[PDB]
Amino acid sequence: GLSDWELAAARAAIARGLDEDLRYGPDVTTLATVPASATTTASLVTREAGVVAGLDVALLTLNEVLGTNGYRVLDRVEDGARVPPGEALMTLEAQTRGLLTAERTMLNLVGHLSGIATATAAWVDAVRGTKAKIRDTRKTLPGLRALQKYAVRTGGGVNHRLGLGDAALIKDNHVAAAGSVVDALRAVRNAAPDLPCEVEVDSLEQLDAVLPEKPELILLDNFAVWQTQTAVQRRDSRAPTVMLESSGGLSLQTAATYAETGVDYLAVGALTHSVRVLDIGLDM
Amino acid sequence: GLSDWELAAARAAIARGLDEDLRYGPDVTTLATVPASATTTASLVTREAGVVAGLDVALLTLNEVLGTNGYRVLDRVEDGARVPPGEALMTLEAQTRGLLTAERTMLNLVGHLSGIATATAAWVDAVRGTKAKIRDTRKTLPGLRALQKYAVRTGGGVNHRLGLGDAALIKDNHVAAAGSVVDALRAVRNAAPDLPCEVEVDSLEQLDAVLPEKPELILLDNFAVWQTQTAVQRRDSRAPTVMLESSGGLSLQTAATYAETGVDYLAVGALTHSVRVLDIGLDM
Ligand SMILES: O=C(O)c1cccnc1C(=O)O
C-alpha cells in the first residue's frame, strides 16, 4: 500500500490539487445546484481497460473534502487489478456536494497513476520469459515522485534510486568532469564506499575499461541490440557479478529484443515522463 | 514571461523537485568528481523538434541552486520558438556542481512544459483556417496547473477556467443532482448571475432545451461531426450569441473536421493529461 512517505506525498498532492480548484472562490455551480443535505452512491468507473493504481489516493481526497465519517465505501477493487472497460473501481455513498468538489482532483490523480501502472505492466509483459526487470528513472514530475514510483511498482516494475544521495550513478557529465570513467568510479568508491554505485557507459570501449573495476551496475546508454549482446557476453566472461541495465533507445516494440540479450534491467523513462491517462469517470 | 502567479507556482514546483532529489543526502557523485571551483559553459539542447516553453523555469532553478550571481546566460531562445533537433535552447556559464545538481529538476520541468506547448501547437496547426481556438481543461496534474495552463497558451492555445469558482460549468453530475439541464442552468443563473456560465449537453435534445435559455457557452459532450454541424446550424438560427465548444471524442486526426463545422472552440484534455515529454538534454 502507500508508505508513510507516500501517504504524506499523497496528502500534499491532494492539498495542492484542491487549492488549485478552490483558489478563485467556492464551487459556485454545485452550491447552486445541489443542497447540503444531498447524498448519492457514485462509482469510479473506467472508460477503458488497464491496471488500476492510486485508489487510496481517492479515499484520501474524500477524507480531505468530506472528512473520514463523510462517506462510506460500499465496494472497491484492489490497486494492481487488471481491469476491463466499464469496471466499477469503487462504489461509495457520500454527501453529493463533497463528491462534485473532490471529483476532478481525485480522478486526475488515479487516472495519472493508473496510466503509469498500466504502461509499466505492458513493459513487464513484453519482457516476460526473460530475467529482465523494468525500472524507473528520476525523470518524474516535481512533487509527484513518490506517487509515480508507487505506480510503477503497482504495475510490476521495480524502483531505481529515489534521489541523488540515494545511490550513486556516474553519468556522462561526471566522467567528463572526472576526466575518466575509471577516475570517476574510483573517486566515488573512495568517497562513499558504503553506497551503491552505477556507472553509465556509452561505448564498448568504456565498458571494457570499467568491467575490471567491478561496479555494482553499468547502465548501457543507447546501445544497439548488437552492442547490448556483446556487452552481456563480455560481462558474463569477465565480471559475472556486474549487473547490466539498458537505458536509452527503448521502445515497447523493441523491449523483448533487448531483454533477450540477457540484460538485467531495462530502465524506462517514459514510464514517468510521457504518461497517458487511464480514462476514468465518476458516475452517479 | 511568467506572471507573479506562474512565477510562484514555478518556485514552488522547483522547490518540491529539489527536495525530492536531496531528501536522501547530498549529490555524492558530483561532490566526489567535480571540484567546487569548477565552471563550464553548458547548453540545454533538444534531442527532437518541437515548441519550447518553460525556459524561465530553468533560470529559476539555477537561482535557487547557484544564486543569481552564480551563473551567466550567454544565449537563449524565446519561449514559443519552433525548434529543430539539435537546437541549443540556452547556453550558459556556471559553476559545474550547481549545474549537475539542478539538471534533472530543470530538464523535467522544461521537457514537460515543452511537450505540452508542442502538442497544443499541433492542434492549432490542425484547425488552422478555421475560427476555432484550442482550449484546455481542468484535467491538469496536482500542483502543476498554472505551469500547464501557461504552456498551452505558449503553444498557441487559450486557457479555459483555472478553477471551480472562476466560472460556472454545469456538468452531467449537476444535471443529475438538479434533475434537469434547464433546472440546473436556471439555478446557477439565480445564484451567480454575474459569473460566466457554460452548460454541458450530451444530446441535441438537451441542446434544444437550453438554447432558448441563452447560456454563455454550451459544451458539446462527445458529439459526432454530423451532430456538431447540426448544433452549429441550430445555434446560428436560434441563439446567435451562444458560443459552442466541442469536448469529448476529439483526436488530432479529427480536429479539422470538427473545426470546419464552425464551432468556436475545441476543449482538449489530452493537452495536459497524457503529455509526452519534449526530449532535452544538458550538454557540457
Ligand atoms: O538517475 C537515475 O536513477 C536514472 C536511472 C536510469 C536511467 N535514467 C536515470 C535518469 O533519470 O537520468
Ligand SMILES: O=C(O)c1cccnc1C(=O)O
Ligand atoms: O471543468 C473544466 O474546466 C473543464 C472544461 C472543459 C472540459 N473539461 C473540463 C473538465 O476538466 O472536466
